[PDB]
Nucleic acid binder design. Structure first.
Lengths: 22, 92, 78, 99, 98, 103, 92, 94, 80, 21
DNA sequence: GGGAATATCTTCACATAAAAACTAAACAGAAGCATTCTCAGAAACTTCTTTGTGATGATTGCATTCAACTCACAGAGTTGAACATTCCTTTTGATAGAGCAGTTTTGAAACACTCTTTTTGTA
DNA sequence: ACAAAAAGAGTGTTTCAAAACTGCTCTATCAAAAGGAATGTTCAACTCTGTGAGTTGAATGCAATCATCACAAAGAAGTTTCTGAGAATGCTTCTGTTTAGTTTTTATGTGAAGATATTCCC
């Protein structure tokens, strides 16, 4: 799943950005 | 004669993955990527200076252009890196 | 409740101008979410321009520049 | 009946007018709320023209999105706009045009 | 006998970035810290891409980064994917979906 | 003796020349480039204004308004493609209802 | 103190519809349109000159940029008008 | 069978159209677009043109398939492709 | 007409669709896809040769294709 | 159809998503 | 239909907000000329595309079929538009009033230019 | 070792930033007011599901064929260098044309009014 890079930049995988989330 | 960023991409690759090689075509892709991002940032800074009736592209335009072009955390870390570099550079 | 400020009849009028005949009930929450997402993107860039200028007011030109960089040229306010 | 085509009159009237359809004060309240959520420090002021341009852009965006989503509605053999239609229209428009 | 890149702590050519800025007629005049900032940003983005590409080559059980790994790295990070949204990686393939 | 008159244009060749020189487009600007560009701009506005004037006349009005500009643009495929990602303030939409609607 | 193409747009309007007027908002939209198209064409011509290692933007770049930006029938008449104007201009 | 075909194709990267037919098609389009002066084509120009065309088509098929699923079908139709082009909107779909 | 558009064969179009993830393909999809590919190529090739003849050249370079795509909104990376 | 001052037929944007034959 | 009824049409008058017309003044463009420097053209070299040949075997094409799909529809179940009443929120018009944007002016910092020295990618 | 790019120094210029100042326009308030949103109900109008009828695409297996690969040759086209001619720039002077501010018309939107067009009953 989500993977922290070689920095504090946590690199999430793309998701259903097209769905309105609360 | 012909400029490129292959030597520097290889250096940073040695830094981040000191044991992984890169293909000739992947290196071309990385050159294309560097040129693309450079052009985006430089053009955004150019039009920022033109909007504000300024005539010089300072490190402040580069910062704002980076804020406009990159997504959230990418931009945060990029701004951090750039400010760190210019501080270390002037402190000499 | 500023997001609730967009009312059901206003969203309905938007959909009707868009040509929609029948509108579900969840469309209202969906549209509020979509409008909020759209506004966040434009307002972020607009205040970025406003901060790059040493200003404290957001300008029609700041909004216009934000929209153009996101690829939505607007003509009435240049 | 109660009303033969009440929606059709509304559509035909709205598609020939050009005034904004959201109310100025609610829209400006929402916009200012978002703006302060972005600025940790002191809020910015807003030109009346700035808020006006923002509302024009937002309404044009939403109207075009409804037009695109209704095509997916009719595509599914329906006439009721569902949220899944809007979601799919956003997904197909892409990251830029669909946020 | 010290390069501006070395003074900034970078691997990317500050002098070359400065020359490109000056000759690209982006503005009539270029500040001193502008190429430093820009090279730092370019180097950071290159590092972020190459790291994920190397991770993809690793768990793909390979040893050399190929365009497939760059594509996998880009399309699997949401921010990088948003940045390179209209970009086609030649010989990159797609991501497995249904 | 103006360049616009010399070229037969209504658009300002000198102003376009200055804008080209000051816009950071190239180091040098040829002599015919502002003439060509001004001619192109004048032609495009002539097209748009003609279509918009027709749209206004068909509405029994003598003043062009953003609604008429929008009607003129969205009804010409060439201009509609040129101004594809352009929003016109106070322009409304085209009166287009789907066929499955009207009984 | 603020230059606008309003007078030229109005001249063209008088040429094409001699008895029609234009609102102030419509004139502002016409100004936005002219500025937008100018910027598009000039940016493309700049990119062309830079691709060919030239330092001059000539009427040849403007023509090519017009061919790239405008859809087909529009571009045909646009280059017609442009070449016609430059001939009439060099003939003096 | 189609499942293993899909899984095999989605992990590969090679071009799916044949280079020589693609080249013939591109060249005849170019000669239709010419102004009486013929052009040559670098071998890399045709590879670049084919890399872009195939990526475009693959992405278009992905979008069109989402429309097929929306309509409750599993079979891709020309109306699903036509609608995906319409929603993409006159530059991305074209 | 006899060929050169039929060179895009049904198995090729099917491979494209499968890589796109399409499980099941209708029969009119092939003509639809040939038309779509044709209109895509016509737009890119026109711009490519426009660049190529603005430069006073006779060979369409890979960079001409890259510029055509970039101006149409599609950036290609492996050919710089 | 509809012709402007120049011999430019300004056709209306009927339909483009459908392929021709 | 056949007259009733209204909503939707056209017609007229007026206030007015808004556009058109007028003025000066001021700013920028044209004229003229000296200088510079860019690009066309030519010649020599090279390199990369086109054209052609031959094998071949990998891939396409053709025909069937039948399992796997699409489609229409009828009934069951769900819900959104229409409608009547209340009230509350938006609008509009002041009204400070003050905070901030826009202008000018000045002055120190910073950058362009130029010449030198020096480091760096081929030898 | 050497050519090309980049640091390094120093000088001149220029520009942007800090300051002070002015006025303008944004915010916050208020006060009606009315009209439009919220509420609740209903049922016609829609969506969903399941079935059965009708259609068709993937799978399979043959022969045919042509994409590919290699190879070579030629020569067309691109590249590099060099030169000078003319075209662009830079600068100064003058005027004419653009713009901001007035101030004179005038579409137009409103509103009222009459009727024509649309519509209900049996």
């Amino acid at each position: 799943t989500s993977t922290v890079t070689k920095s504090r930049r946590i690199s999430r995988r793309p998701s259903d950005w097209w769905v309105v989330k609360s | 004669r012909k400029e490129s960023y292959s030597v520097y991409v290889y250096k940073v690759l040695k830094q981040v993955h000191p044991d992984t090689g890169i293909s000739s075509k992947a290196m071309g892709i990385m050159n294309s990527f560097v040129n693309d991002i450079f052009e985006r940032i430089a053009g955004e800074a150019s039009r920022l200076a033109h909007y504000n009736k300024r005539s010089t592209i300072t490190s402040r335009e580069i910062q704002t252009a980076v804020r406009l072009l990159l997504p959230g955390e990418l931009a945060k870390h990029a701004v951090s890196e750039g400010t760190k570099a210019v501080t270390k550079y002037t402190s000499s | 409740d500023n997001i609730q400020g967009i009312t059901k009849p206003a969203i309905r009028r938007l959909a009707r101008r868009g040509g929609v005949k029948r509108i579900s009930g969840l469309i209202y929450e969906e549209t509020r979410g979509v409008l909020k997402v759209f506004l966040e993107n434009v307002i972020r860039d607009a205040v970025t321009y406003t901060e790059h200028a040493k200003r404290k007011t957001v300008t029609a030109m700041d909004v216009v520049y934000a929209l153009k960089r996101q690829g939505r040229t607007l003509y009435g306010f240049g | 009946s109660r009303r033969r085509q009440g929606w059709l009159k509304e559509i035909r009237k709205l598609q020939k007018s050009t005034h904004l359809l959201i109310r100025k004060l609610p829209f400006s309240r929402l916009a200012r709320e978002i703006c302060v959520k972005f600025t940790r420090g002191v809020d910015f002021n807003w030109q009346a023209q700035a808020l006006l341009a923002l509302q024009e852009a937002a309404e044009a965006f939403l109207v075009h999105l409804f037009e695109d989503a209704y095509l997916l509605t009719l595509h599914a053999g329906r006439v009721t706009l569902f949220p899944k239609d809007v979601q799919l229209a956003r997904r197909i428009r892409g990251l830029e045009e669909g946020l | 006998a010290k390069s501006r890149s070395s003074r900034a702590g970078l691997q990317f050519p500050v002098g070359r970035v400065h020359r490109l800025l000056r000759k690209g007629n982006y503005a009539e005049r270029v500040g001193a810290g502008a190429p430093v900032y820009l090279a730092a940003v370019l180097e950071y983005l290159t590092a972020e891409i190459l790291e994920l590409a190397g991770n993809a080559a690793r768990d793909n059980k390979k040893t050399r980064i190929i365009p497939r790994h760059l594509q996998l790295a880009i399309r699997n990070d949401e921010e990088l994917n948003k940045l390179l949204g209209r970009v086609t990686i030649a010989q990159g393939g797609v991501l497995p979906n249904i």
